[PDB]
Amino acid sequence: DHRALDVATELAKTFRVTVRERERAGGTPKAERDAIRRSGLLTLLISKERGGLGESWPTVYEAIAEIASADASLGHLFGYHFSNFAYVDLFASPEQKARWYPQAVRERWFLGNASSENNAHVLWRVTATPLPDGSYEINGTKAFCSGSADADRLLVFAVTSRDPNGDGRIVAALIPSDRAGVQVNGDWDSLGMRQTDSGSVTFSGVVVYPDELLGTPGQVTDAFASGSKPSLWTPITQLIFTHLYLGIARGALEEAAHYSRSHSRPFTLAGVEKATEDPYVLAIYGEFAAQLQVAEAGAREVALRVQELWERNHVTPEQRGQLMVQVASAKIVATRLVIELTSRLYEAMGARAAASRQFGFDRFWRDARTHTLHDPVAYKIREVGNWFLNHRFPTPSFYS
Amino acid sequence: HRALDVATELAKTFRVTVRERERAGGTPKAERDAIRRSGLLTLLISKERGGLGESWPTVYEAIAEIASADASLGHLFGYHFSNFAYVDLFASPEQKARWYPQAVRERWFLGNASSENNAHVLDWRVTATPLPDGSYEINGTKAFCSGSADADRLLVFAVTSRDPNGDGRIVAALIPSDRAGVQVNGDWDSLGMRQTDSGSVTFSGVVVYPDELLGTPGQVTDAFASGSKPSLWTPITQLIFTHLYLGIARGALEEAAHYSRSHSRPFTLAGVEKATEDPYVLAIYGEFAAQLQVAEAGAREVALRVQELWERNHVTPEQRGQLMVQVASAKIVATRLVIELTSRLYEAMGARAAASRQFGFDRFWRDARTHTLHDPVAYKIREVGNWFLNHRFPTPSFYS
Amino acid sequence: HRALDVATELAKTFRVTVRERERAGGTPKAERDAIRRSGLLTLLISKERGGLGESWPTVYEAIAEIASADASLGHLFGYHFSNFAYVDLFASPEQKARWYPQAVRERWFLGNASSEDWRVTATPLPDGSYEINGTKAFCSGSADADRLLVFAVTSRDPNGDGRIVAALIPSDRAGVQVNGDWDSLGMRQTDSGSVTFSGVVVYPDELLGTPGQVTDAFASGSKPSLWTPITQLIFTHLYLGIARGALEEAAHYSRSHSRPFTLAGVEKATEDPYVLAIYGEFAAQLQVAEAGAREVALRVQELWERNHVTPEQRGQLMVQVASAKIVATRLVIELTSRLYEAMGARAAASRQFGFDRFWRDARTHTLHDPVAYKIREVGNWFLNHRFPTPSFYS
Amino acid sequence: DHRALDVATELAKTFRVTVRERERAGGTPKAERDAIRRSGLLTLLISKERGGLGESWPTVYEAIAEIASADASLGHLFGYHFSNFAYVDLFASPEQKARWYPQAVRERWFLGNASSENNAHVLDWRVTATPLPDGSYEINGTKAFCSGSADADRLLVFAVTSRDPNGDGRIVAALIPSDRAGVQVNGDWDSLGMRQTDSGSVTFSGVVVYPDELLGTPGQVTDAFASGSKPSLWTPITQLIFTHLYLGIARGALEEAAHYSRSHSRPFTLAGVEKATEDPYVLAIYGEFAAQLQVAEAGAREVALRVQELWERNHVTPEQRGQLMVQVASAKIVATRLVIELTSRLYEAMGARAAASRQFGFDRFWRDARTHTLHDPVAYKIREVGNWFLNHRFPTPSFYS
């Protein structure tokens, strides 16, 4: 059954037509987000009984990469939707799934999030203060709120305060984006990933109801520290990022090759008759396509392990740690590959590819160079080294 | 996992003695006999013919496992399966019905006499002269005859000469290594792969009987030029090499880390208290370990595709060509990785890992540096680039 | 050291405004006039003819300093000296006695209309003038140019078609149309669009040598073939200058804006071991590349002053220049992209930081001619003792 | 004239003829050390008065690189002689120089050293200097990595004071005869590469060191380095010696590969190549590496000239010394990466028979480079350059920075 991927391929073909002009303007890709809504693919992981497509993580990852190859901002928004959905699905009650998932199919929910902040260090000042009847009031500003614009629901994270049952506990809630007191600020103006709407969101006395809470306050800390099933969220999400990088890489390589076939001039001073026969043009394409073939094959194999563990009732700390090691290794390789490829392929195309800004090939490097900084690859490398040398699995967190 | 556990236990024994054995060079007779007794030489022979009925994924994992311990034994074992692949793809069912039970019962370890030391690799001078009964007489000298010592049979290639039906056609045969006129010269003295017995073999009036011939004269050339199933021999064999390189990489990385945990000193000049906590030491293991995880995951996917096509009655040129591209890609990546890693890991261990020659860690680089030159990775890179850029599959041959 | 101080002060003023100017593209007229007022366009004109009587080492260092502040102004400045070098190597002493004092008095900033089977023809007229027709591409510095160095191929010529002629002409000569069609990834203010020649008359006292003389000089490896190594080392210094500017600009950001990765236990970004390793690797390569380029620049000056140059001397210089360009190309391309990893996501999240200018400028200009063939040329020399075949690119 | 460099070039020619067979055996290259003695080059930095050659550091560095290109062990022994000489010259008294330097010319001294130890880390020194009467010291303990300790006319030796009323833990250095009673050169050097540098252990049992053999007072070196006084030049001088070893090895390896490619490599006729020397990828490998080598070598010449300029100054500021160390460290980083990559990757330009035939011996270049580049970790040289560039902090002077 290749139907969902055919749908994703068609969406990607449509986005390529206009990505050049859209990403320059920046702002919100409303018409494209609506196309994704009409496609149904946002419901890939909702069971058919709940109205969804009942598909699997390997299908999701393939779709992410295909869309990302055409438009990295739409690939990112799509992918982050599934990170948000993964978190919801790992913590939602049976009651929450029974009503939210049919509603997500019917209202075509495209999820956004508000998690990170811009404080002195990456570790939170957005507060959740208890109310009567079990409610909480959210106050503060979040940064890098990907897909916060035109989101139907926001996955929001806060830390308890003035809480008789414990301060500093992490609350997560799934709330309407138009809930009173929620202000999406629209201040995203980035080198690349220009249509991800990853600006700031301000919360002024925003009410969260108990039926919107994803677990009890602090449950995510307990689930991660114990390697409970929700600790799969991080390898899942980091593998989503990996697939954005491989998709950008593939898109840049294909776009460059089409330029070389149709536009490059041979370096006829050295007796080359066509650029596509030049030994150094061929070596550049061979070196990068070969690394891409291995990385994609490896990413498929890790995607299948995500699915296998996703279906288990219990995942051991060793199973989760090994997956996280495999995922981090994939992200490392994909980061280096995409950053190098999107810059060096100009050398296979020639000066005219840069002399006309409107050709727009630099979008691939700008998108990859922006996103690959999401968290430092130097510390993903350290985690894999600490694992290999010292037999220490990474400590489960939002980042590892 | 039975077969793989046997391979692991063999490797563990080989590790104890490889340092002393490979200095001397020469034939690792005791270790070859232990491989004979293991049964693993029969991995791909069907259970009906007395073999293990196993698959290429298992063979590839066993090759890498043995090579991680002793690269020469891994090579001999791996090349045995390249020789077996050729016999299987070209021999008649009647031949295999006789040979394969005999190979089980007599514990056959196959060697080959194929390449030559002439002006270029596309220039064979070992000749097959047709005799009236359908026999041939082989004359000339072969080079790089891996596993030619202590071999139960040699896979021999020659070109027809004095042939009224056409000179220059390639014939292949499977013959006893002690047949009259066969002289294994024992002149292998190399930088690495020191116990592969890849010396020269001289044929003086060597008779080949019709029931020892593999196909008809020039049939292998016809199969290559057609991209038909017997041309799978090359991607199969090139993926064997790939697994040697991944196995050496993994062995070198594990041996380095044992030294780093046990013997490396902290660089207290800079405030480090434990070498295993040094950030640059950790970054070296992390970078190489990550690349190895991705390469090993991708290699497993290509190994499954080898098994799929291996089981088909007919293979198209597009199936074979796509597989060869995937193999070539894995070989490029594995080559770069093992060459870099076996040299750079010294930087994670310190000067005394090199100042004490008897630690012997340079064996990994010597073995990898020798074997990776088998055929030029620059032209594997070209082949992948010519495919990606120009949609041309590699021209099938003994190398591509 | 005065010339270099003047260049340093020019560069300081250029850094204030480059971020806003380069976005707009077009012609940096005010900055070109500041260069005119500095006197530095006359660095290589002898004091006898009213210039500064300075050396190629000073010129190269000045180019790299200006480039580190504004790569387009560094390129325009550098190319001026490529154009000047061509004039000096092919002009008659009588031509120089007129042109160079005029260049000083009128503060000439030279431009180029050479690159484009040449579509720009020179048809001989009976007096020895030539009529030029066609459109040139990549005419760097073609706007606001006091003179253009122009190349064309003879056509309808009893004395031989396909011979290269070169001339130095006014940019407002009748029939010259500078098109302003330059909208590029980087080098955005170099005015490297096209120039259209419609029946443009070039007079005999404007011609540089005789038709085909530049080809014969290349084939001879004689002194005028120095033009290529000279110009390729100009490019090298553009790349070194961009490298240095990017590194210093990144470091400023790291000191002022980078957050530490507290989840690793890091207290300060400037103490992060991996941040420090990025700056160390790139700063170390940059030091060596800069030191090596100073030595090649001294050799340019040595041969520049000779009456005669052998093909061996020229070929050895070209190999040294090619080597420096190769190292400088790899360095600037890798550095301008990887330094983001030392600064953090917010350096890319805020487009207005504008750090991507360094990569865009370097990524654009390094494509001028393919570094893969500079590598082949050095390898063919080392392995086969064959010098590069002289051309406009080697 | 180029007389001294001509002498070095002729020495290196002769060493090349026999290095392949000599380094296999390891042990002491006595005959070659004697040829260096007869050459007079060990006196390069002794004034023409005192009988030396009155030459400069740039000449020294060029000779080191030239000899190293032919025989890395002899290049190392030669370069380390000048590191030892530099330390002596920076700390010796005027009467010590008046006696030692003519004696070094007369007796053709080839210096070695016994400095490092094999304890828990490189700061953990346990070879002790215990006071004797009349200002002498007794040395006890074992040193490791004692380069040139065999066949040495004098050993430069380092110890830490113990049971010393004038203060314990102070570093003393002395220049002593290698056959003084109680010095035992152990002959246990058996290395991957640098196999003829005699960098094994030396054991000191009751060895007497006299006051006129002490190089400054105990602890003077700590003050001179910490303060950036003139002796703090010893480290950039010596690290630049290491840099020229790597560039010498790189050049010798590149030239040996090119000889093999021209005469033994086969064309990959499968792809239509008729001559390996016209193969586009063979040419790219030689071009990449020759290009980086030219730039590294040109750069090294500039830094060598700066060494000479500061060597001649009466006082060097911390900023001048720190700039020099950063330039030296930069040169060493680039040269380290270059030699390690080149000596491995050039096999790809040569072909499989270059590895298949052990006796070709090309792996010597990698073995020598891979061994010596580990002397001190390049990762911390990189960190030191980065700390300077980002934080404007010069390296803290030490025996390594």
Ligand SMILES: Cc1cc2nc3c(=O)[nH]c(=O)nc-3n(C[C@H](O)[C@H](O)[C@H](O)COP(=O)(O)O)c2cc1C
């Ligand atoms: C080939 C070689 C020669 C050396 N020669 C000396 C020497 O002459 N004097 C000295 O103090 N250290 C010498 N060293 C050692 C370094 O100063 C340092 O002690 C050593 O490289 C650190 O070892 P480790 O990284 O295993 O901990 C030498 C090291 C090598 C590899």
Ligand SMILES: Cc1cc2nc3c(=O)[nH]c(=O)nc-3n(C[C@H](O)[C@H](O)[C@H](O)COP(=O)(O)O)c2cc1C
């Ligand atoms: C920024 C830039 C400036 C250039 N300036 C000049 C110039 O002033 N004069 C000239 O003859 N060529 C100039 N070129 C010409 C390059 O040689 C040419 O664009 C390149 O070789 C074409 O590569 P392609 O045909 O594969 O696209 C310039 C190129 C670039 C990228």
Ligand SMILES: Cc1cc2nc3c(=O)[nH]c(=O)nc-3n(C[C@H](O)[C@H](O)[C@H](O)COP(=O)(O)O)c2cc1C
């Ligand atoms: C393109 C982009 C999208 C991001 N999206 C999210 C997001 O959806 N949710 C989130 O919590 N953080 C998001 N982040 C934040 C990063 O995880 C992290 O906060 C940031 O890289 C820190 O910046 P620094 O390295 O300068 O300190 C995003 C970052 C980037 C660059």
Ligand SMILES: Cc1cc2nc3c(=O)[nH]c(=O)nc-3n(C[C@H](O)[C@H](O)[C@H](O)COP(=O)(O)O)c2cc1C
């Ligand atoms: C360690 C090693 C083992 C080899 N074993 C075989 C072999 O068993 N059969 C064969 O036909 N060629 C073998 N080869 C040789 C390659 O097929 C090929 O002939 C090689 O490229 C030598 O050529 P070169 O020196 O020109 O690069 C081997 C090569 C090496 C380095």
Ligand SMILES: c1ccc2[nH]ccc2c1
């Ligand atoms: C190259 C050519 C022919 C061969 N037969 C077995 C191996 C092998 C390698």
Ligand SMILES: c1ccc2[nH]ccc2c1
């Ligand atoms: C550390 C201490 C003293 C030394 N003398 C020569 C090298 C060296 C290293």
